[PDB]
């Protein structure tokens, strides 16, 4: 408007305003103390208020970036603490803002943030709700300088809502701790997703991204016209290019403009944007991003007509291959919400691979008159797995099932950090329950969304601590082949069973006194180690020793003494195993 500051304050509101400014500065000045950021926020906020009362007061005409940069440069110890970053204060705005971007650190050498006791958290919440929430928001923000601010804000309110509900409950911990875990996990998945897209836009390219967006937007807005979808994909692409550069304000405006365009064209995109569009800026785009799939028109012909029989097909394909394959993808995508984008892309690639060789023959219509046959095996696969796993996830519960993955993966690539094997296994497990719950129509898309992050996380580690090239092969394979690659790893047969060591299996009674998350992650570390020492063991074998061990501990937690039991009735089990498996 006449003043940017004013305008952002007016529609964001004072409370949200204060919290975003805090997250902003917390992400650059990651080293300064909370108390300092509060002075800052309050200052900036008093100024904002100045521009709201008189939208023409001194300096209110300045742009946010400018103002932001000016405040960053007033920090007395900028150069002493951030050193080179302080040099940014010498450039002329555009360059300055760009300079600040590139100096923001991502590996803040800061201590892991620990979860204090429920009683103290609850007490802290109660005594001073704002300092408590804003303090932790500041803590999460300075350790994650790239986590999109608004989204972090959105998480805070969930944290606030969980304390609010739990701290005044009967069994606080049992109420609170699980919700805090659902937020930690969820919070990590979100961080991972946004870095993955920005990475993909880098690797795979702007085109591949678009292909991905068309598939995704068509499943969500099946009723819209290819032209309409296509318009949204071009915009969606920019939004994410700019956003991936890292400027919070630019990124925010792009998401806002798009969300507004979508709401002003509702009846041309979806009939599911009712709610979201009534919401205020902040929540609007976010809301839209999680909207449900509109229903597809019952009418809808079939792909056969326009993509196989129809004359002009090779003609349409040569005039605009990209737009053409875009329409294929679009038409298929909107008819199949239950497919994972990536699956939709193999289909699209395959179709392309056929028209490329087929429109080169003397009579194509014959060459490609059976493409849809090549599609069946490609679709059946991801489906059949989803079934094999989700069904198995029944016989056994999450934990007992994570123990199946655990063994299966340790035997594929046994030369991998045992604690990385435990994390990945457990993570796959959670993916199994977060999804297998959904109906046979949201499964594949869910898995795709969660398996991806888990897979990238596992590649990032493998990238930093390489070991097995097979994984490397999968980690450097194509966007569309990553998963199948992993799903095709066979048990490794070159493995040299790990040197024995009874210590790795030496246990004590200190475990009859540990929470689930504890007991588990230990019964699982031995299980993994047990496979690396005798990978030639079978499921009947391990499903046996897993019992001779489990029900063994219950016998030491049922004995007057323990230490002896956990060594006496132990070792007795070790030998009874180092024999029954050799
Ligand atoms: C990245 C991220 C982490 N967290 C969680 C994970 C962190 N612990 N660990 N590991 C915890 C630190 O308070 O917050 C969150 O709530 N939101 C987020 O966006
Ligand atoms: C669609 C989607 C996007 N994101 C990313 C993309 C958003 N940025 N942009 N553009 C970012 C917003 O926090 O989160 C996400 O974390 N989960 C999702 O489901
Ligand atoms: C905008 C974010 C506001 C966050 C307020 C967070 C309060 C978090 C307590 C977190 C305890 C986490 C324990 C853990 O991750 O292991
Ligand atoms: C002086 C510091 C000013 C910081 C202002 C931050 C404003 C953030 C607005 C974010 C709007 C997001 C809209 C959306 O995601 O759809
Ligand atoms: C203003 C944004 C409205 C977005 C509605 C999005 C439905 C999105 C499925 C999106 C996958 C998006 C990836 C990205 O945005 O970078
Ligand atoms: C208006 C935009 C139309 C875009 C049409 C895109 C068609 C993309 C086919 C992409 C195949 C990608 C295969 C791969 O990335 O490995
Ligand atoms: C020790 C490192 C192990 C890394 C394991 C990566 C495993 C990826 C598995 C994907 C499995 C899909 C299974 C299924 O669909 O039924
Ligand atoms: C404990 C792990 C449970 C895993 C269940 C995995 C279901 C995976 C479905 C994968 C579909 C992949 C589709 C694709 O890659 O194109
Ligand atoms: C040298 C002998 C090493 C034995 C290692 C045994 C590891 C057993 C893990 C058992 C996990 C059982 C889980 C369950 O029963 O629900």
């Amino acid at each position: 408007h006449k003043s940017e500051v004013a305008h952002r304050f007016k529609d964001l509101g004072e409370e949200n305003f204060k919290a975003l400014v805090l997250i902003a500065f917390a992400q650059y000045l990651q080293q300064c103390p909370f108390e300092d950021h509060v002075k800052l926020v309050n200052e900036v906020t008093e100024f904002a208020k100045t521009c709201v009362a008189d939208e023409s007061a001194e300096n209110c005409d300045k742009s946010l970036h400018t103002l932001f940069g000016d405040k960053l440069c007033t920090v007395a110890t900028l150069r002493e603490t951030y050193g080179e970053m302080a040099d940014c204060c010498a450039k002329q705005e555009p360059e300055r803002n760009e300079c600040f971007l590139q100096h923001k650190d991502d590996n803040p050498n800061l201590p892991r943030l620990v979860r204090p006791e429920v009683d103290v958290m609850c007490t802290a919440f109660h005594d001073n709700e704002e300092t408590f929430l804003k303090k932790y928001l500041y803590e999460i923000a300075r350790r994650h300088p790239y986590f999109y601010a608004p989204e972090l804000l959105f998480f805070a309110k969930r944290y606030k809502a969980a304390f609010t509900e739990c701290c005044q409950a009967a069994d606080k911990a049992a109420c609170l701790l699980p919700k805090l875990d659902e937020l930690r996990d969820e919070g990590k998945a979100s961080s991972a997703k946004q870095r993955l897209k920005c990475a993909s836009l880098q690797k795979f390219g702007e085109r591949a991204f678009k292909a991905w967006a068309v598939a995704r937007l068509s499943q969500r807005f099946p009723k819209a016209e290819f032209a309409e979808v296509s318009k949204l994909v071009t915009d969606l692409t920019k939004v994410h290019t700019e956003c991936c550069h890292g400027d919070l304000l630019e990124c925010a405006d792009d998401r806002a403009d798009l969300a507004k365009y979508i709401c002003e064209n509702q009846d041309s995109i979806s009939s599911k944007l009712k709610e979201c569009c009534e919401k205020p800026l902040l929540e609007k785009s976010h809301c839209i991003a999680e909207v449900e799939n509109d229903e597809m028109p019952a009418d809808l012909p079939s792909l056969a007509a326009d993509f196989v029989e129809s004359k002009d097909v090779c003609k349409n394909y040569a005039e605009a291959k990209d737009v053409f394959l875009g329409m294929f993808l679009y038409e298929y995508a909107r008819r199949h919400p239950d497919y994972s984008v990536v699956l939709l892309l193999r289909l699209a690639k395959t179709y392309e691979t056929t028209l490329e060789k087929c429109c080169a023959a003397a009579d194509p219509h014959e060459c490609y008159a059976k493409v849809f046959d090549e599609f069946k095996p490609l679709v059946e696969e991801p489906q059949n797995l989803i079934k094999q796993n989700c069904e198995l996830f029944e016989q056994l519960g999450e934990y007992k099932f994570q123990n199946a993955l655990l063994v299966r993966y340790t035997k594929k690539v046994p030369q991998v950090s045992t604690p990385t094997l435990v994390e990945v296994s457990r993570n796959l497990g959670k993916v199994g329950s977060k999804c297998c719950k959904h109906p046979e129509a949201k499964r594949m898309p869910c898995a795709e969304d969660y398996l991806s992050v888990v897979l990238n996380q596992l590649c990032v580690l493998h990238e930093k601590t390489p070991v097995s090239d097979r994984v490397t092969k999968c980690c450097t394979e194509s966007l569309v082949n990553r998963r199948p690659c992993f799903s095709a790893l066979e048990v490794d047969e070159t493995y040299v069973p790990k040197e024995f060591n009874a210590e790795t299996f030496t246990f004590h009674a200190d475990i009859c006194t540990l929470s689930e998350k504890e007991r588990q992650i230990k019964k699982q570390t031995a299980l993994v180690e047990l496979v690396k020492h005798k990978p030639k063991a079978t499921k009947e074998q391990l499903k046996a020793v897993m019992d001779d061990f489990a029900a063994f501990v219950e016998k030491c937690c049922k004995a007057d003494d323990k230490e002896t039991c956990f060594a006496e009735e132990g070792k007795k089990l070790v030998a009874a195993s180092q024999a029954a498996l050799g």
Side-chain angles (χ1 to χ4, degrees), residues 345-412:
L345 292 173
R346 301 193 188 92
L347 298 187
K349 180 59 176 188
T350 275
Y351 180 61
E352 173 198 60
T353 295
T354 280
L355 293 193
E356 272 297 302
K357 64 183 171 75
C358 278
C359 297
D363 179 33
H365 199 306
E366 292 296 301
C367 173
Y368 63 54
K370 290 172 283 294
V371 280
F372 289 45
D373 284 308
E374 311 173 65
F375 292 178
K376 195 194 178 71
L378 240 37
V379 158
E380 299 174 58
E381 204 253 310
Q383 299 185 314
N384 290 305
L385 272 183
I386 291 185
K387 248 52 62 184
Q388 186 210 68
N389 301 300
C390 284
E391 259 176 50
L392 185 46
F393 183 88
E394 249 50 300
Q395 292 77 66
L396 354 162
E398 177 182 291
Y399 169 78
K400 190 173 179 183
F401 165 67
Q402 295 182 310
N403 286 304
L405 317 160
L406 213 12
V407 172
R408 170 188 167 78
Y409 296 119
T410 285
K411 314 185 75 173
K412 294 190 184 299

Side-chain angles (χ1 to χ4, degrees), residues 6 28 202 302 306 402 422 460 482 485 565:
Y28 288 88
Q202 178 67 303
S302 181
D306 305 289
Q402 295 182 310
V422 177
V460 173
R482 181 168 295 198
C485 184
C565 185

Side-chain angles (χ1 to χ4, degrees), residues 340 342-343 346 382 385-386 389 401 405 428-429 431-432 444 447-448 451 483-484:
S340 66
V342 45
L343 169 54
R346 301 193 188 92
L385 272 183
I386 291 185
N389 301 300
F401 165 67
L405 317 160
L428 265 339
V431 170
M444 198 179 287
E448 164 194 46
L451 224 44
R483 199 281 303 167

Side-chain angles (χ1 to χ4, degrees), residues 209-219 226 229 233 326 329-330 333:
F209 182 74
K210 282 180 178 182
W212 195 91
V214 171
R216 197 59 215 172
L217 295 183
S218 293
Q219 305 181 299
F226 176 73
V229 168
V233 152
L329 218 184
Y330 160 69

